[PDB]
């Protein structure tokens, strides 16, 4: 489960990067 927790954290960071890019 920890592997998937870390992987989904990766995904969340990438999506937040997309959101910050769109706001800019």
- Measured from the CB of residue 9, what is the shortest distance to its own copies in angstroms? 4
Helix then strand then coil, % of the chain, to nearest 5: 90, 0, 10
- Measured from the CB of residue 3, what is the shortest distance to its own copies in angstroms? 6
- Measured from the CB of residue 16, what is the shortest distance to its own copies in angstroms? 4
Is 24 strand, coil or helix? coil
Q: Alpha-carbon distance 16 to 22, whole Å?
A: 10
Residues of this chain that interact with its own copies (CB under 8 A) are 1-6, 8-13, 15-20, 22-24
């Amino acid at each position: 489960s920890l592997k998937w927790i870390v992987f989904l954290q990766f995904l969340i960071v990438l999506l937040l990067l997309a959101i910050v890019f769109l706001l800019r």
